[PDB]
């Protein structure tokens, strides 16, 4: 809600959904599960994704790291996966979804 409020007066339109009750309780995967699932439930075509978080460096220092989310099936299926065998488009989209959920989990911690 801090991020929301900071950008509530400039970028409120860009906000699709904002998730509250963050920080009060230690985050876990299920919380990230809720966030990612509702993100899919929105139905917004998030072809390209980007997650921003203050990665812990030291007890006194933190780094605002950004990790890209190549959620789109097309970008997930590039030349790099030419050598990959069993992966099918459907389960690739599923894999990108699970990756989204777990990267949300990792970022929260």
């Amino acid at each position: 809600d801090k991020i929301r409020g900071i950008l509530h007066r400039t970028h409120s339109d860009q906000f699709l959904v904002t998730f509250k009750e963050v920080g009060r309780k230690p985050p876990t995967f299920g919380d990230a599960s809720v966030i990612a699932l509702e993100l899919l439930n929105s139905g917004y075509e998030f072809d390209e994704g980007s997650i921003i978080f203050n990665r812990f460096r030291s007890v006194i220092s933190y780094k605002t790291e950004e990790k890209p989310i190549f959620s789109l099936d097309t970008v997930a299926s590039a030349e790099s996966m030419s050598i990959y065998d069993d992966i099918d488009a459907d389960v690739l989209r599923n894999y990108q979804e699970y990756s989204l959920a777990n990267i949300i989990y990792y970022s929260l911690k």
Partner: protein, 132 residues
Amino acid sequence: GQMSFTFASPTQVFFNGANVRQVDVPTQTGAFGILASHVPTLQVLRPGLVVVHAEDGTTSKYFVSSGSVTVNADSSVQLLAEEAVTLDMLDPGVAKANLEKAQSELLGAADEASRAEIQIRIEANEALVKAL
């Protein structure tokens, strides 16, 4: 054959970057045994048992809910599981109870979506009671 294996959960971390011979994994679209140089295959998991055939000779057995079998081109397989649970802590009596209860719920699940949810329950319970 010097295959680094990373089996980790959000709560606990199992083998991490450890050389293993074979890792039988309960993957969707059929179960395929992770090898030393198996073709890079990004496949999603299904409820079932994972057997890690450690190079020493012993084979540890864990139960997996779901996740991704991220075996790379090199000998690095990342077995991320949402719920990585050992076989001992699972309760067989309540496992059977839940299986039968979900099987009963199947008929009452009028909605095809709800019936699909109970189907996921019974599938997990089937693998569970096989494990127990």
